[PDB]
Symmetry: D2
Subunit: 364 residues, 4 copies
């Protein structure tokens, strides 16, 4: 482990892992410190949906950043593979955001003004996905909201960053950041390092660093538990989605099913009531899933923030320090764009003022 | 593997495993053939309740055999331990068979005429188990219906039988039984053996042998799925039981929760709807369980028979062949008594004519 | 479960699965009976190498078959994906059959005259695979001996078959095959069925059927123990092969390592001595593997025949009954060719008489 | 989570757990903050030997402490069961410290003058343990160096503590300990708390607190890798010990084997080289283990200090702050004595000055 780097990334999740990749692409000698194993926390609990549309509320800049990030996923799997040997496992089936009420229809039809987003009548859906619940008023088919396996998207980025110089240190918790002197100074139980730039990408745990650097930005964990089953009997190509819950078909024959939302809960293991809730919900969307064999059950801590938006930007009082945390429900989707934006702020290139202002560290 | 044995046991579950023990106790040179690993099937899916009372319907001989078998469990754990080093993990907390309706009360109060079976008012129960549902009309406390870990009761018997001569062969499926010649003849992919006595203890799979020996006795699988959670917050000493479902506290801090009843289903892995059903049921009995961390989920095939009673006895046309299969819901409880009875029929001792007639192979 | 099928396949490993698929494709009312779960035995333990050049020490019928089957894999992945939604995870890195002595070189050079196969020097190997043992005398590069994940290619076959109308019955052991009427009669615990064609594809457990049908063909299990690790640090694109042992890099970042050769052992879980043995071997081939984190360990029973060759074809005295078992170390590779052969025979089409004679059921 | 507690224990491994229990027993409004789950780190990796005679190469204060702690285990199981419902799984077989050379004998004989410790000859050992290596020169029998299952004794302490009023907070990392008011101030992501006594028991991660409080005591992880097997065939009642390596027979039928010694490695999962190493060692001590089925593999970080001795006591410049970390290879054994010591110090009772000086925080 060297003693000085031009840039150091604190966090081995998909965010920090992506940032490390883009920096090493800029040939910027950089290192990354992960308290545990790469993509070992929230990142490996994610479904992997590139849900720019499905998670759309309004038409602000957040949505544009997301759409931008979604474009970035084009070919990215090939890029990282040729450098890692790790397949991100992309599935282009698309998504069916289901409607079970008139209110659901009103909400889904607000995307009529967008491409690759078309409305399907109940019969049109059941013709493509015969086993989707028959209680549907129809669904919105989002062709681009496809999916990938987050754990491998992360491992791909990391393995690729290494083959580009990046030095990755696991089981190396960063304990403190000293912005004193003329260069930044980080301390770990394995040693202390110097850098010209420090990027906080510790997910929901990032608060500690903000505080350390005088900032007050807080994070709230939003626990989500899921399960998977083996779908050996019915066909299911498109991802079924409804009210923040989903059933995504993996290329392995497994269906990733989930999401409870438990604010303030820091535990990372599923509770009985949580899984029961997911099982109950999934049956209303895919009745046949009740006969499928259960596989695994897990949980993750979504990095929540006061306004639901992430913090992606320079420290107000010190541009040498940056932050990329609080991607709540879209960390996987927004990785490519978050990485590029941080790498572009370090390389001091020109960046979209709207996005940069949208995610600024000092918000009302 | 020898070529001749005075007695051969076909089945390594808890039944065959117990029979092998008692025979080797009689110093009868015997061997056992298990298609897979010992106690690897239904036996290791069982909760381990010695439910002679809880599974009581009427007051026939079946119930007496059960009560007898329950007595046999006295000290048995010590006996087998001193010979195996394997602890059966016995828990003497007792059982609370809960009542949620007047009909439940009427049914439970029919045991008033028995010792170690007392009625508890709602308040008396909540005083002993504060977290049991408050919707109860009270419960029947069955002091003797305690529990053990079946897998280890089985391993204990087997390990003990070995230290007594018994020769145990795993991964040795018995393919056929020839009662021709003057001695029995069994065939396995690993060889053929001769014996003076053959005992069929293949659980729900025993049908094949009955047929082979001209008998028509059929078996129906009754699949049951369960799960376990970690109870790190509340006290729970007594086993909560209701309508064939239960919550049994293990000495490890885990709660074994279960039982769906799926007739005709031969699959041994839980389906999503099954577990959801168990989770839902358990919450009505122990509301707090919903906050507990899930551990594992599994399933087993209860050996079902036409009249709900097992077949424990000699082949009508050949006393050299015996059967001990179809213990449906009480295989763990009835092992000690089933073993002793079979070993007593081989050693040609005198046995209870009622039990012997109750479980005869040729029934109406 | 119907009462009559044109064809009944007994066994659901990759072989029976492939067979069921091709029959479904030929539009034949077909059913497959699997004792447990599809691909749950030997198939799930295999590395998945299409090692057609491990059977070229003599360019006979066997080698032509292996080569032909290897050819059939071109495009098979896409074909099955379209119908299954399951990715077989094919990796085209190729293979480096390492040499650690002159004799090794002499032996390995003998296949230089083969197409897509060429020799590399100790320094030309290290140029591609820098971390390969520095004690090698070079290696033969086999471009076409790529690899897939056996379990998924099996599940893809089965799923594709289901979509084409094949009826798959898991947890349905076939107990006995009867021939008396103008058709066959199969017996399972879940009822009986009639067919015009029965195909025995029970892997190493096929013996009982051969014996049931008058043949004495024997099967001997040859246990193989393996392990896997995570290769997060060094590059490895080619599979390293030596003395039947190997290191195959999967697209997940895992290295599948192995195989012990234990004749007559029917246990399916690895023992300590065997794993130590595999670890030791792997280290001689890829020194760095010593610092890699262990993932999993497992074992499987290669189905061995007296001559180590499969029995693929009709029953000598009944062309309604076919066999397809005993693929020692090449079950995965030969899956396509074996399935096409059995399917074509049942369709009574024209077939290479050399192969048909090479796999005769009654070999001297 | 309240705002003020008399005592706050930081760390939930067996040490902090024990401490929390004794304080609860002394009726002290106490809270314990565990970063993840109770006993989820090093504690869960330990074998659980009460090896008090591994620290007698010099009968000093350390040995007296070890002996005293070993004494405290008498009855501890029952005491914690009564309150927890958790069995600690104590096994009293004793230990055979094997000798493979004359020097081994010379060294091991030196403790013959100790009570309950006696020497056995190569033939007297094989009389008790027939399968012990035939290459031994005999062994020392330590009757009191029995074993328990670390995880459960930890969970028993915690549960017993909860019943006595201790408030345990999992998934609650303590970020910083502040001293300024008349009391201490602990900071967690889930809020802040005040206390009159803080006890640092974070195992190998304790360094950051020492440093936060002005001390420079360092911790170095010494990774230990292990594995387990099923011993279904041979008898083994005594634990086999040699050169810090061991084979402990558990009451489940498992053999816990191990320990590699890897200084400075913070990874918590075993690597291939380390496991091969452990397997090789075990085979020299118990040849038959070679044919046993592998169960699991795991690792843990022994918390190492400059002198391999724990830091147990008050902060040199603030008696409100205590430490209890760095129990290299004896954390389990010393759990009772360490907990009683810290509890008594907080209760400001009389304490053995020799031990208090042996574990001083500022050792030259
Ligand atoms: C059930 C569930 C389903 C989801 N599905 C989707 C989905 O379909 N699509 C999508 O886009 N998003 C999804 N998400 C959200 C997504 O998982 C997250 O937003 C994303 O993983 C966050 O990534 P991260 O890199 O910011 O943080 P994390 O992945 O949580 O990692 C932070 C990392 O920093 C490390 N760290 C913490 N403190 C320190 C320290 N002091 N020093 C060094 N390292 C430290 C951690 O150990 C960890 O490796 C889902 C979330 C959940 C819970
Ligand atoms: C969810 C669940 C909970 C339960 N809880 C309880 C409880 O609390 N108390 C209680 O008393 N009972 C309980 N039971 C029931 C109990 O598990 C069974 O009655 C008992 O395990 C049956 O034991 P067995 O030995 O007859 O059969 P099994 O344990 O099913 O074993 C039969 C054995 O024979 C082998 N075999 C089969 N065919 C062959 C062959 N051809 N050659 C060689 N070997 C062969 C099998 O592989 C297997 O090892 C429960 C069951 C379930 C499903
Ligand atoms: C460690 C190891 C590594 C290997 N690596 C390779 C490799 O790289 N490449 C390669 O080509 N090969 C490899 N092989 C070999 C390959 O795994 C086998 O040849 C192949 O799996 C055999 O497939 P199968 O379908 O014939 O049998 P199996 O996969 O063993 O399945 C037979 C099936 O029939 C079922 N069955 C049995 N009896 C009955 C009954 N009465 N009724 C119904 N079903 C029944 C079984 O339960 C099972 O599903 C390897 C093997 C091992 C052990
Ligand atoms: C392979 C192996 C075998 C062993 N065998 C034995 C044996 O036979 N006998 C024996 O006596 N010893 C044995 N030991 C040693 C023994 O395991 C340890 O000494 C003991 O586990 C240490 O316990 P601890 O509670 O001090 O630390 P740990 O058990 O490591 O736990 C420290 C705890 O503090 C938590 N923590 C860390 N930072 C924070 C924070 N900021 N806030 C809150 N919580 C935090 C951790 O997450 C963890 O729960 C063995 C060790 C190994 C590795
Ligand atoms: C993008 C998305 O839908 N994520 C799911 C979740 O966070 O639960
Ligand atoms: C004896 C008993 O209650 N068993 C439970 C079950 O079989 O589901
Ligand atoms: C030649 C080959 O693929 N061998 C694999 C195995 O059976 O271990
Ligand atoms: C002496 C002793 O118990 N050692 C265990 C270990 O730390 O590996």
């Amino acid at each position: 482990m060297k003693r000085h780097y031009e840039a150091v990334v604190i966090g081995g999740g998909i965010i920090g892992s992506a940032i490390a990749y883009y920096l090493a692409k800029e040939n910027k000698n950089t290192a990354l410190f992960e308290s545990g194993t790469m993509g070992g926390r929230t990142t490996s609990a994610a479904a992997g949906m590139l849900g720019a549309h499905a998670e759309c509320e309004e038409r602000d800049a957040f949505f544009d950043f997301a759409m931008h990030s979604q474009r970035l996923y084009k070919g990215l799997g090939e890029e990282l593979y040729a450098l890692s040997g790790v397949d991100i496992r992309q599935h282009n089936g698309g998504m069916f955001k289901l409607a079970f009420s008139e209110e659901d229809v009103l909400q889904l039809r607000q995307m009529d003004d967008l491409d690759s987003v078309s409305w399907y009548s109940k019969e049109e859906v059941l013709e493509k996905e015969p086993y989707a619940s028959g209680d549907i008023f129809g669904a919105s088919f989002i062709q681009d909201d496809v999916h990938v396996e987050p754990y491998f998207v992360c491992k791909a980025y990391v393995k690729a960053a290494k083959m580009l110089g990046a030095e990755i240190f696991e089981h190396t918790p960063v304990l403190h950041v000293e912005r004193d002197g003329e260069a930044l100074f980080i301390k770990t139980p394995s040693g202390d390092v110097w850098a010209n730039h420090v990027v906080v990408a510790s997910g929901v745990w990032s608060g500690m660093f903000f505080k350390q650097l005088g900032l007050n930005n807080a994070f709230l964990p939003v626990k989500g538990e899921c399960l998977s089953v083996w779908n050996d009997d019915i066909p299911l190509t498109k991802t079924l989605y409804h009210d923040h819950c989903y059933i995504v078909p993996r290329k392995s024959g497994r269906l990733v099913v989930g999401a409870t939302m438990k604010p303030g809960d820091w535990s990372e293991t599923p509770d009985l009531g949580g899984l029961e809730s997911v099982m109950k919900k999934a049956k209303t969307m895919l009745p046949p899933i009740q006969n499928m064999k259960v596989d695994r059950f897990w949980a993750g801590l979504r990095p929540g923030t006061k306004d639901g938006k992430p913090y992606i930007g320079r420290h107000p009082e010190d541009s040498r320090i940056l932050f990329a945390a609080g991607h709540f429900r879209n960390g996987i989707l927004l990785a490519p764009a978050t990485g590029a934006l941080i790498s572009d702020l370090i390389m001091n290139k020109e960046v979209n003022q709207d996005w940069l202002h949208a995610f600024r560290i000092d918000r009302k």
